[PDB]
Each structure stands twice: as C-alpha cells, then as structure tokens.
Amino acid sequence: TMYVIKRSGRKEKLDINKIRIAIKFACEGLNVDPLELEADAQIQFRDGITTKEIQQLLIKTAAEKVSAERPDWTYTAARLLLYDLYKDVAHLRGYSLRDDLGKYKPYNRKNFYSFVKEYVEKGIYGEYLLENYSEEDFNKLANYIKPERDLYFTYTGIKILYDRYLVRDEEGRVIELPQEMYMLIAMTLAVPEKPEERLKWAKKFYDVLSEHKVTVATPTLMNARRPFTQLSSCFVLTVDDDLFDIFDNVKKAGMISKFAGGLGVYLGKIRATSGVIPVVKLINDTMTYVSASITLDIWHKDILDFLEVKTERKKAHDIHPAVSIPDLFMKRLKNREDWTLIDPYWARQYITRKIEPKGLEDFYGEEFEKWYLELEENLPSYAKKKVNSFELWKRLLTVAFETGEPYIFFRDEANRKNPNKHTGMVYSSNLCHEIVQTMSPSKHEKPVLDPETGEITYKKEAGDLPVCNLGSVNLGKVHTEEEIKEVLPLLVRMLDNVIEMNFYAIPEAEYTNKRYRAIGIGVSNYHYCLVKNGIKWESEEHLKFADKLFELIAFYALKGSLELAKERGRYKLFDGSNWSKGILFGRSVEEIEENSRQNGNNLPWRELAEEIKKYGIRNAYLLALMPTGSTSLILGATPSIDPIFARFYKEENILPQVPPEVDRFYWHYKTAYTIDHEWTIRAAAVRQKWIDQAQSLNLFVDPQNIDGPRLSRLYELAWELGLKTIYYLRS
Amino acid sequence: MYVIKRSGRKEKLDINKIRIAIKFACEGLNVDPLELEADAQIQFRDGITTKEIQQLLIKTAAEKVSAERPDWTYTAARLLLYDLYKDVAHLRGYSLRDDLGKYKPYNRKNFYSFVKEYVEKGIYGEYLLENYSEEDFNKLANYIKPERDLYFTYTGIKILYDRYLVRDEEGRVIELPQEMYMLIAMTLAVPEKPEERLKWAKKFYDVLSEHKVTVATPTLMNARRPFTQLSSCFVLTVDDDLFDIFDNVKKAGMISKFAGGLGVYLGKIRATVIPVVKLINDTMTYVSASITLDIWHKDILDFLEVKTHDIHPAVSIPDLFMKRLKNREDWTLIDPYWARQYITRKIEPKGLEDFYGEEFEKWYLELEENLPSYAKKKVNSFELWKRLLTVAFETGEPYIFFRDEANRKNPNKHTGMVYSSNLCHEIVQTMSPSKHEKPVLDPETGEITYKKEAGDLPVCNLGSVNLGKVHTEEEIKEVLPLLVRMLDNVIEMNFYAIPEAEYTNKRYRAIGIGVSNYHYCLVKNGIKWESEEHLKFADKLFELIAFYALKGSLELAKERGRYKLFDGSNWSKGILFGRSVEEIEENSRQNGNNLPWRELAEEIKKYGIRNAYLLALMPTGSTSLILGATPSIDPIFARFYKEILPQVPPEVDRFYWHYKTAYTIDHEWTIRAAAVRQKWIDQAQSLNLFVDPQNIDGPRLSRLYELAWELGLKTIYYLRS
C-alpha cells in the first residue's frame, strides 16, 4: 500500500480519486483534456511525496501545456495555484474553507474586519482604513466581494500578482486574496469621498477593478492599502546652470529612485565643455548607489559626446539618453544643409543683454527660429561649432539601431499643443515618453543660522515638477459608447482621488499636483480590439477605426473631468488655458464637429466646449498612452498600442503568454516584426488628434527587411504627421 | 650699438648702467659681480629691449644658485624687485626719485590714493576705508620698512609675485610685498577696539614683515579683498542616510570650488560604501580630498585598492587591531548597519564607531561572536597589515589615524569624539553629523522651508612660527601670544560659505599653530638628527611653544571671554595635554625650563582660555618657500634642487655636512623625536616618512608604523620613496 505525507505531517493511503477531483474542478468549463493531466500525474507519483509537491507538479505541468492552439490550459494552471493560495491563507488567518452546511467557501466574509484590523495594528495596512470605515462598513463590503472574479486570471496574471503585488507579513507569507486586494484598493481610493457617499464609491471602484475593465498603475496596485501610499509613477526635473540646483536635482533623483521610479531629467540649460557629461556621470552614480531618462537639445555643443554615452572615458550605462529636436533641424535635413551647435551659456548672455534671464531653450517654433538664425552668425567662434545635419542624423539612427536609444522629443509640436502653455513651456518628456506637461526649475534663497539654537533654515520657491498619476482602459471589455460613457468618468474620478491619497516625498511634487491635478489615461488590448472587430493592421480601416474609437475616449474623458469641476471646483491654473478658450487638442470645435461627422459618432462637442468655458475641468492634462507592462499581464491583455510580439512566448523568474482568443483569430493576429510600420505611425498620428499629451510609440524593425534610408523615412514621417515623441527602437 | 627702452625710443648702449644695476644687486652679498657682468656681455644683442636685458640678468643669477654659493638667490630676488618697483610705479603714476633725487622704491604719499581707487574697483574690500581714516593710512604708510624686501630668496619673491601679490582686471601686479603685509595686518586689526587698532596693525605688520611668523595661504592672498576666504580645511561627518549623504556631497562640491583641504569620514555608511567614494570623486572632478574608513569596516579590502583616483584614502586603526597583530591573530570585519542595530536594541541610534578604547573593545568582543554570518567576515591581521604597507609603499597612501590615543587626548571629549583627521592629518577636533527635519510646504505661496540642527564641522584657522628666528624664551614669549591673537582675529574676519562652519568656529574658536625651519634650528644649535640630544632639545623647545600658546589664549579669555564650550573641558579641570601638572612640572625640571605650570593651570581654571585647540604641525608648503625656510618638521630633501625655483637650506655652505638628507636618515629617530614633541601638542603632526627601497625592506617598514603607535602618535601622513 503506497502512502502520501499531508500538510499536518502525518501519513495517508494514496487516493487517486482526490487528484481526479482537484483536476476536474480546475478544468470545469475550460477547453482542455482532464485525462491528459491525470496521466501526467500518474507518471509524477512517488511513495512518500508531499501533498504540497503533488499540487506544485499539477500547476507546472498545466503551465507547460499552454499554447496558441490550446490557450485554456493557462486558466487550469491559474485555478490550481488559486486553490493552493486559498489553503495557505486560510491556515494563516485560522478559518476553514467549509461553511456550516459543508459548501466550499474560498473567501471568509466574517474574517475580513478581524484580518485587516490585526495587520493595521502590525503596521502592514494603513491606519486610514479603520479611521474612515466602521466594523459594519467592513462587514457590508466583505459581503459585496464576488469570489467568482478570480476565474478571470491567466496563470501569468495570478503568478505575477502572487509574486510581488499581494501583501505579505514580516516572515514574507501572503496574507490577502486577489478580491480582498481589489476591495482594499477601492476602500483606500474612496477615503477622499463624503462619508454618506463613501461605500457607494468603494463598490463602484471595486466593480471596475475586479471586472478587469480598467487598472490603476503598479505603485497604486501594490501600495494603496499601506501606511506609505506611494502612488506616483514618474517625475520630470528641470535643472538650472547653478552648483546649488544641480546638486539639489541630483538629491531628488536619488530620493525618487529609492522610493519611486520613472525619472526624467532635462540638462539642456547646463554649460557646454567641465561641461554637461560630468553631470550625466553624477546622476548615473546615484542611480547605481541605491532607470532614468536624460534629455539634451540637438543644438547643444556637447551632443556628439552625449549620443556616445551608452556605446571614450566618458560613458554612463544606467541612464537612457533622449534628444529634443526642433522643426528647423528637420527643415535643414531636407536640403542636406549644415547645423550650428551652440553653448547655452553664451547664447543666454547674448539674448538676455538684448532685452530674470532668457536662454535659447526658453523659446519654441516661430520665435526660436528668429533667435537661432541671429545667434548662428553674431556669436564668436569659441561659443559655436559647424556640423552637417545628415552626418549627425545618420549617427543618431546608428546608435538607435544598436542600443535602442536615444528616445526622441519633437519639442515644437509638443509646445504649440500644450493646453497649459499660459503657465510656461515643456523642455522634455518622462522616461517612457508619454508625458507632455509644463515644467520649470526651483529657485534657492541663502540659508540663515541662529547662533543661539544651532538650527539652519533655507527657503526655496517651488518650480513646476510634473508628477504622473496613471491608469488604463481594457479595450478588450470597453470599446462601445455605452461602455466608454460609464467607465471613463469613473477612472477620471479614481485618478483625481489618487492625487489626494498620495504620500508626497518631494514638496515640489505636492505643489504641482495641487495646482494642475494632471492625470494620464492610456489603453491595453488595442491589437485584440482591432482583430475581434475584423480590422487588418496595415489598412485604411485601421486609421478610420482608431479615429472613431479615440474620439469617444477623449469626449467622455473631458465629460468626466467637467463633472468633477462642478462638484469639487476647477484646477487652480484653469483660467487662461486652451480649455478655457474652447480650444480642444489644439483644434477649433468646427474642425472637431466635422471630424465627428466623418467618424459617424456625431457627438455634441460644441455643448461640451461651452460647459467647460462656464464650469472648467478638474484636471490640467487627461490622456497619455503609457507602456502598460505588468498591468496588462495581470489583465491578460496585449500591451498598450503595440502589435503582439508573438502568438506564444515565455519568460523566466516560466510565464507563458498568449493573446486573447489566439486559437480563434490565429492568422488575423500579425506579429510586430512582419508589419510595415509606416502604418503603425499613420495610425498613431490619427490617435494623436484626440490625445493632449503623447504616446510611448515603439518601432519593431527586422535587420533583413529594413535598411538605413528606410529607418530615416519612418522617423521623418513621425515628425511630418505631428507626433511629439518616439520611444524604444527594437530589433 | 643701440637699445630699445620702455618708452619705445632708442638709446646708445651704455655698459656702465648694466654695471650699476648688477652692483646694487650684489651689494653686501657673497657673489662675484664680474662673473654676471661677463655673462651680460655674451647675452648683449643690437636692438635688445631694456625689459629683455633685465629678464636675462634675473635668470642668469638664478642659474648660479648652489649649495656652495647660495647668496646668488638674493642677487636674483633684488634684480626682480627692481623690475617690479618700475612696473608698479608706472601703473600708479609716481616716480622712484624724491625731491633730492634719492632712490625711493615705495611711495608713502600714494598708499591712501592707491587703496581707495582699487577698493572702488572691487579689488580691495570696503572694510579698509570703513575702519581706517586718510590720516591712519598715511601713518601706517610711513611705518612700512622697505629694507625688509631684502629678506626674500628668488623662489620666495617669485612664488609671491606669481600667486599672492594682488592683480588688476588686465592681470598686472599693483601692490608691493610690504604693502601686501601692511594690508594683511590692517585686515586682521579690524576686530580690535578703534583706540587700539593702529597699535595692533603695526605689531601684526612687524611680526609678518620680519618673517618671524606666517598666516596660511588663504589668509596670505585673501585678507585685503571683499571675499575674505581665510579657512584652510574642513572635516565632514556623514550619517547612513540619503539626505545627509547628498548634503555632504553638496558641501564637498561647494568647499572644493572656493576653498580646499577637505576631509570626509564614511565609517558609518552601510557595507556592500565605494559608490559613495565614487560619488565624492565625480564632484571633485566636475569643478584634493581625504576619505577615512575604520579598519574593521567590511568593505576595507576594496577601499585599500581605490588608488591602485582624485581622492586620498586614510584608515582609522584602534589599539585592539595592533594588539592582535603582535600575536599574528585573526581580525573580524563587521558591517556598521547590523552592528548599530545590535548595540541600539541592546539598550538616535548608537553604532560601534561611536565608542573608543576601553568601551570599544568590550562591544567589539561581544559583536565578533553574537552577530550572524552575513554581517561578519574573518581575515588575518598580518595579511591585512602587509597589504596596507604594500599600497603605502607603491602609492604613498593610505594615511593613518590612531583613533584611541586621538580620542583619550581630545581636551574637548565632553562635547563628543573624533572619527578622522583632515587631508594633511594634523587636525584632531570633535566632530558630528548635521541632523535633518522634514520640509514644510505653504500651499498659498510656493515657498518650502527646510530645518537642520548644525553638527560639529571643524574649520582649521592656521599659522606657523619661523624657528629660524624664534627659538629662545624671550623670542617665543613675545611672538606666540601675538600669533594666537592674529588667528583669533582670522575667525572674526572669515567669510563663511557653509553655515555649520560659522556655528563651530564661534563655539570652539579652534586654531592650529605649527613651525618651519625645524632642521635649520637643530643644525645651527649643533644638534645631530640621529641622537639623544635631538630628543632632549625637541622636548625643551616644544614645552616653551606650548606654555606661551596657553598664556596667549588665557590673556584673550580675560579680555574677550572664554570659548562657549570651555566649561567641562580637560583645560577647565587643570589637565594639560592629557597629563597632571605634577607630571609636567617634573618634565619642566628635566628640560631645564622650570616654568610656572601650576600657576598657569590655576589661572586657566579661574579665567578660561579663548581657543578650544591651539597646536597642530601642518605641512608648511608655499609659506616656507616665501620665508626661505626648511619645510615644517621634515628633514631637508637635498642641499640643492629645483621645482625655475632653485631651493637651498639657510646657511647650507656654512653647515654643508651638518645637514643630513631625508633618505639617508634612520627614521626610528624621526618617530622618537615626533613622540617627544607630541607630549606638548593638543592636536597632531603631519609626519612624512622618507624610505630608500635599497636601505629598507618589508619587516623594517612595519617596525616604524608599529613604533609610531607604541610611542603615542595620533597620525602618519605620506610615505615617500
């Protein structure tokens, strides 16, 4: 007689029937063969095996079977893991998975209040949960949880969630279940709401999260619950040519990278050659000590050395370079003409003495060109350098092809579209290059010593430091007007609540968020949305459909922000904005109304333009298509606006990934490296008409299929059609 | 046939005018004017400029400087001085001739007009016109002694002319050496009571112009100007904390741009520290800093190998390590982070480094067993010791800090402790990190307000005594109190760039007095370096310097008030240089000085002293080249060498063989001599060791370092070869 070791030490006679039951529950409703997995378990059986070992084998074997031809094995693997998690957490919190009548209850509604209370008192959960909810509130919300929504998770979804999202105790054990996580996130985001409305909003937030219609960013997904509510995704720093500010921004970069991430740094003001790259080296070393973008204008004298940072004694391998390019450079490139490099220091002096200093970088477009033409002659030989446009352009694309960097920032279109151009301008984007928000450096005052006490007090006037508060819409489940009309206003509300509940580590961050209340709404499952609507990627139908879809998203994004303004008040800096003059996405309402008719949406854009002029909007910025990374893997969605990499592939920590309904739509899905990205860019240009910020546009090129002069044509077309950024260039 | 003059023009060559220039320059000096006259005949060419002729006489005279004919240096110096006088006279629009037609290099009448004009151009500071009347300037202008320019060697005046004499916007020298000294004295006299000011300006001018003392390089080139940067060095203490680490990185960058002499202690930082070392290095390059680490720190192996590139490593060594090295025993490396937690939870955290000596050993023995395997690392003492001396022999670094003797001798041990020294390793002053508070945003305005509680950040305010001219009790009794007063005035007139610097200087009022011409002082007193007579003479001399240093600080306390943190110090309990007055009184009798040490101990207990620290033998560098002195307490490198800057010891011809060069000396004597001096020095000494690869081996080099520790030295500096 063969034996098996159980959780409670002990020893029990092998029962083949109990393994059959576990497999049957896990395969229920799913297009798989339970007999196949039963056979594999017979082969994997060994006398004295632990019940824990048996469960780990069924999970792994099921995950090994995931394919483009049988994708449902992922759901079988996920459930087998879920059934193991339920048992672990039940034993840790001291309840049973059986009720009075002996039915299976993975979730314990009675335990919810006791559980959260205990781990609030251990410093794992934040105090604001007990302060803003009564025992009856907890009990009411515990009974609202829908345990059947755990059946929405792919194996990689729950595996990623289990590995670094589900909260753990001091000894590193998982304590909360997926639906408990979602409810606690909803409860955290509902705190800023009026006490008589709080439970009503917590239920709506829980619904839209648990049903996988929207997701909040990774920071919010793992911190909204905890004492330290770090909910911010990225920061954008502006550095003045000044020992004090340079070392101040180096400090912020170090503080940011320890606690948060997504750092972007503009060094275009810094003096030309110590120079600028010692400052780049200085930021690099703080990065290593504890994922940051550094931006430089393409006319900066040190640009040649800056492009070579990631590829002779002056390199930096922990930073991501980016290049701010004006229209004039692109105009020069057409006729293969020459390009004059300049030093900001001598450029600043000249302009400042020709009129609170003003450099060249403090102008864009029509004005910038006037100053540049005058500066490229009337400056002395020591503050200039002559180079060929095509020679520079060619070397950039060569580095881009080998390293993937640098990222591009088309500063002229970015600035003339900035709807808050009345409060300043924008010198760079963030790391992922979706953000376009007004920015400026902090100003310092001389410190003061009190000899009696020994305390020193220094003061600084806060500058505009864009924080990004991010979420995304699952286009798999939200693509109709009815679905968009419900969901977008709810996501706008959640992200405005994120700003109120965020723990601010940098004071300038708090100052900027309170004045602007900027948010970034993106999308996932874009490619799946096209395929199930029978739309080919490389077609006129793609461009026409993208136009129609992103019009709806923009309309109900503004509608949502308007309602918050009526209810909470407009953002402080609304008066003077493009919004306040009835200019939406840098276009007249007559232009939009004509676009609305061609799209077959026929939305009331004029009536909305009038209500925004009267009541304002709650948020200074709204839409930015960010790279969606871990949040789409949890949703089982295709990433952002990217075309899929493959119909099936893996990763390592095994994370097998298939697009939604890949078996049903096999050939309707076309992989990234097989697509002519002239279409990708035309499609992005159509979307850009309804996006106030930018898009993290990747380009996927095959060395065999693409050459030097064709790669140039893509980048040139991006500029021509009015894109503000380009992100990674993969191969 | 013809020569071009300053005023364009053309004049018939006159061989007599070159003879006169050479005669004035050789007057009273042991040289051959005919030799230099012959060389000038060879160097003559038709259409040569008078300027070119003068540059040739200067260079030729400098080329003749040797150990057998040193007076050529004075001939070269004077020929340069006569050129400087002409240049400055033409720039300020006066003549070198008076009413009767006598030679007047200095224009007493022009002094007020000159300084007034260049104050109004932003070259000289406003405090000069604010604290002195036209009659004051005129009185001090008439006190100047132009004959004191005859005290300069060629390298002395050449260094002074190149780096120190103030220049206008077009880069031309405007002030003469004696004008520089008077303007320095006038700047240091500003803090004095208006009815006493001129009296102190004349005394400061006298002691500077007569080359009896010098102030540090910063004071020598800035005391005169609007930006009075008079500080020589700073010592930073860094807490294991993002905010403080980046705060100290900012200070290091601010300090190195404007000042220098930086020292940084990183012994508190968490074990894998070198990313922080790399971070300090990059700020240094962006715009000469020491970094110190305890020898028990887990990252010490990687830290020793940093220089095998813009930083100078140093190692804090406790007694226990040296005790282990005797029996060739093992040495347990530790991480401060886990060491701090253990000690802190066993009772504002308290780490291992926050203890010394008797207490430190108790904690270390307990930490070396009861800690887990991940927070430890076992290594052999002799294996580590040997690798340190190997790097020291190849690179010259690391410098050494014997922290136990340093801390038990700290006379201000009641306000904290000392983790490291400065760059040059003469400084031993109480130090601590600044403590940070959470910033505050006013949403209505844009303004953020940050608070931090200032920590003890030692600034060093430095000068030195010329032992060539000040070695008797009568000379020391006059000069030392005057130098103490000048350095206390330096603290009042210093422009503070870092607020913690201002806070520390005002609380402690620490000063550092060193020496130059030590080797010359021994030789002219007929004392052999490698002898018992050296040890006996050093004892006697440094007793006198210490006694009249304390006397000087006492007088200032009676007059200006004791330093804020006096009460609780070793000074206030009558413990001088970590010894009882009965011990000192016995030492005073053996030295044949018989000084009233008990009476002084009592007066210090009653009235206090003005300065928290007094004595530190710093490397004397540029200031001794100006004085023509042998550097600090070092034995001379050579009887003659170049840097063209030809350098000879004083009276090298007269004392040729009595002078013994550095690489020929058994430095067992150097260390014994330093140990005797250390009994009368409250801080430390920048002790260099000069070893010949052929004459010394591995085990003998170890014996020197071991003996330094045994005899109670607090630091060792460069190891040259």
Ligand SMILES: Nc1ncnc2c1ncn2[C@@H]1O[C@H](COP(=O)(O)OP(=O)(O)OP(=O)(O)O)[C@@H](O)[C@H]1O
């Ligand atoms: N006697 C058995 N023979 C075969 N498989 C078994 C046996 N007992 C448990 N298993 C299997 O072990 C896996 C893990 O189940 P489970 O986590 O409930 O372990 P357990 O040891 O039965 O724990 P507990 O007694 O706490 O419920 C399941 O797939 C189950 O079918």
Ligand SMILES: Nc1ncnc2c1ncn2[C@@H]1O[C@H](COP(=O)(O)OP(=O)(O)OP(=O)(O)O)[C@@H](O)[C@H]1O
């Ligand atoms: N109704 C159900 N639906 C899905 N999974 C279930 C259900 N009932 C139990 N499970 C899961 O099946 C596994 C076995 O649980 P169960 O308590 O039945 O243990 P067993 O090993 O089958 O029996 P026993 O513990 O009595 O020896 C666990 O992972 C559990 O979460």
Ligand SMILES: Nc1ncnc2c1ncn2[C@@H]1O[C@H](COP(=O)(O)OP(=O)(O)OP(=O)(O)O)[C@@H](O)[C@H]1O
């Ligand atoms: N006619 C001359 N023949 C030879 N040497 C001369 C003659 N005139 C000047 N010198 C030499 O030139 C050197 C520099 O002299 P000085 O600085 O006085 O220059 P200068 O041209 O005479 O200027 P000034 O006339 O303004 O005094 C001296 O060594 C001096 O002997």
Ligand SMILES: Nc1ncnc2c1ncn2[C@@H]1O[C@H](COP(=O)(O)OP(=O)(O)OP(=O)(O)O)[C@@H](O)[C@H]1O
């Ligand atoms: N009494 C003196 N003692 C020392 N140096 C002197 C003396 N008189 C002049 N000199 C210096 O010697 C040089 C002589 O310059 P000065 O103009 O006096 O005469 P010169 O150049 O020989 O001839 P001339 O007067 O025709 O120009 C100058 O460098 C001057 O500073």
Ligand SMILES: [Mg+2]
């Ligand atoms: Mg069981």
Ligand SMILES: [Mg+2]
């Ligand atoms: Mg002349």
